[PDB]
Amino acid sequence: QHAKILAIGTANPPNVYHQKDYPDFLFRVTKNEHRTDLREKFDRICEKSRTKKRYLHLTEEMLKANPNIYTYGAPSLDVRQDICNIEVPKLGQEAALKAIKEWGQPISRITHLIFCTASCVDMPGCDFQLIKLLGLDPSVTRTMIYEAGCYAGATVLRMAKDFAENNKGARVLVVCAEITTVFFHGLTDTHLDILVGQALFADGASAVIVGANPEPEIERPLFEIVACRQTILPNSEHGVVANIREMGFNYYLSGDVPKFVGGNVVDFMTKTFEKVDGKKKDWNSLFFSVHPGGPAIVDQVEEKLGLKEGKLRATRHVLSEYGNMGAPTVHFILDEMRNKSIEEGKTTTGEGLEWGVVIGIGPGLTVETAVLRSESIR
Amino acid sequence: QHAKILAIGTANPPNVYHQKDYPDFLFRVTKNEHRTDLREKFDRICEKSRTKKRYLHLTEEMLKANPNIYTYGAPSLDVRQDICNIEVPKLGQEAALKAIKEWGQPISRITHLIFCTASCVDMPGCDFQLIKLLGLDPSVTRTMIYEAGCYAGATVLRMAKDFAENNKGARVLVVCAEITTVFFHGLTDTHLDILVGQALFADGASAVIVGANPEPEIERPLFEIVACRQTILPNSEHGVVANIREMGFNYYLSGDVPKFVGGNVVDFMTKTFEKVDGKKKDWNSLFFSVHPGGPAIVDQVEEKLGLKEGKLRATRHVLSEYGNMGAPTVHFILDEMRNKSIEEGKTTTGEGLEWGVVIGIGPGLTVETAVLRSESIRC
């Protein structure tokens, strides 16, 4: 009786930024139009980003009111936090209400809450704020995951699995929400990593309901969370770093991250599936939700696992339409996969296949995998 | 087959600050000797603190090198983080090695790590840093609890319970570490709450190993984690607030926190024990580890539960000898209880008693309780 995903909901800020327009926007609003060298570099990155549009909370008016946000290294944490500590739970609320609607049970039936964000930090936390917004039972059992990073969309499923399976009748609401206002920085030739985040990072929230022993003909499972594994990729501590500073949340990204992922994916996939089955897996027999940290990560997984054309379609679709929203992204991909599977008349939520995986990738480098089974559409 | 606590280790920074000397120290090193008004207030708080000494990482030399740390509201997060992001995992390491020694198994048997701190935040986190320091398996399953606050010593036991019980053979290392350098602020009559934290807050780390199905040739359980409950006390959102700011981690403490705890303790105890056997009265039958957020919280629990003299001795001992170290404190109290029980020749690690409770109290106000059973002390 494994934990099942019973519902998925998602949300994004209302303002859409088409990638074709973003270089002009960024260089104009940050007063960097004279930096033709940086503009060339940014254009090259955007052209390769495989991201067509992103939703962002941040607006030009907010930048005009708080120019410290685009003045590289200036003190600005306080204004960023004042925004994100409000906007993160609000965006999470929107996703949560959608998940709860799908699930079809009363809010009072939720026994556990996991809230995850890398975009803010406060005491009481986002979990407390969401309890207030939703009217959750004040005795919900909470887990508040702050500043984990891009592997956490898999991690929260692992945590939810344990809580749901060890507590009879438990129903876990999992909310991941990101507002990248805290990570926005201006442009300097001494910190080119910012050009990558400026091209890729985006805002969004997901919500998932998890429970074991779904009520027959009442709850409708989408996926089963079978087994999970977390690991640190050797010799990659510099891959993704983010520091909480007076200037906001600063970050560094190694150009070697894709190669590290590609160099470890056979191993981490093999060791993950060893927890479920003693037989060797055919990687093409699986469905995939891969955290699209950037386009090259997706390509590395495809290449090293020998995946056929189109296997990573759902992943690429979300990267294209939403960008890298951090931890929620893999949940957007599962939702997209389920929806496309309905559209195509597939037999299961996992593209007609039985077994699949969620791959989260973030600081360490850390990879967390969750092995899933699909569920029947009918 | 419930999860058991198999070991507890603790650590503190080396420098001891006796409470009798602390007002003179604080007012001297922060250049506030002219604030005789604030000194009077601080003396009264220290007199009532029931804290005799504390261990602190922060030194006078660090303050001299970084005077923004004592300049109220000045930018100082970066220097605080540069200290705490290093010192928190290091202090945790010290506690963890002690727990691991008691536990008696190789480090390779650790499958899960929970790291908890309210003193810093970074990516990768303290959990990653501790893995490196200890040489844990790179595939340990991690939970990194940042900025929860003072309920979390109970919360991490709840989390460890579920991880240990749902993953057969799992062994969970739980490390809670606090370095209050990030919370140190200077003195202003516009923010008197700082006088309370200056009197009470302290540094320390705990490490606990949790596992179900103890290995009889090696492992020796101390307590069993039976059932847990987390709740928000009504109408108390202003009780404890802490914000992560350019000036460091700022905090506000309502004078009404003890009254909220006292007003709710019978209810939260009753609802917790509803998960076990329906206990509704006669609270003296239990042993207790109560987070000593301040002296008045301890006194309110004692009064409202009708506890007899000496029931909260272990709690009061840790408050006296260590202060309020945040989440680790309740683990120090369990360790003290176990050690006093050995000294006195009690039949169990819980002062001879069978059932007990850990009470964590922090922002929300949030209370997390963990119902424990003790274990036998061999002959």
Residue numbers in the entry:
A (entry chain B): 10 to 387
B (entry chain A): 10 to 388
What does the paper say about this structure?
Type III PKS catalysis involves the loading of a CoA-tethered substrate onto an active-site cysteine followed by chain elongation via iterative decarboxylative Claisen condensations of malonyl-CoA. Linear poly­ketide intermediates undergo a terminal intramolecular cyclization reaction to produce the final cyclic polyketide product. The five-layered αβαβα topology of secondary-structural elements of each monomer is consistent with the ‘thiolase fold’ originally observed in thiolase and present in all known structures of type III PKSs.
Biphenyl synthase (BIS) generates the core chemical scaffolds of biphenyl and dibenzofuran phytoalexins commonly found in the Pyrinae subtribe. Additionally, each monomer of MdBIS3 contained electron density consistent with 1,3-butanediol, the cryoprotectant. Despite the use of reducing agents in all buffers and crystallization solutions, the electron-density maps indicated that the active-site cysteines of the MdBIS3 crystals were oxidized to their sulfinic acid derivatives (–SO2H). Differences in the side-chain torsion angles of Tyr260 in MdBIS3 (χ1 = 61°) and Tyr269 in HaBPS (χ1 = 50°) compared with Phe265 of CHS (χ1 = 170°) significantly reorient the tyrosine side chains and increase the conformational flexibility of the nearby Leu262 in MdBIS3 and Leu271 in HaBPS. Lastly, the side-chain conformation of Tyr260 in MdBIS3 is stabilized via the presence of a water-mediated hydrogen bond to the backbone carbonyl of Phe192. Replacement of Thr197 in CHS with Phe in MdBIS3 (Phe192) appears to be responsible for closing off access to the coumaroyl-binding region of CHS. Met267 of HaBPS is substituted with a Phe in MdBIS3 (Phe258) and seems to primarily function in stabilizing the conformation of nearby residues including Phe192. The sides of this novel pocket in MdBIS3 are formed from the side chains of Cys125, Ala127, Ala157, Glu187 and Ala336 as well as the main-chain atoms of Gly158, Ala157, Gly335 and Ala336. Additionally, the novel pocket of MdBIS3 contains ordered waters that could function similar to the nucleophilic water that is essential for the aldol switch of stilbene synthases.
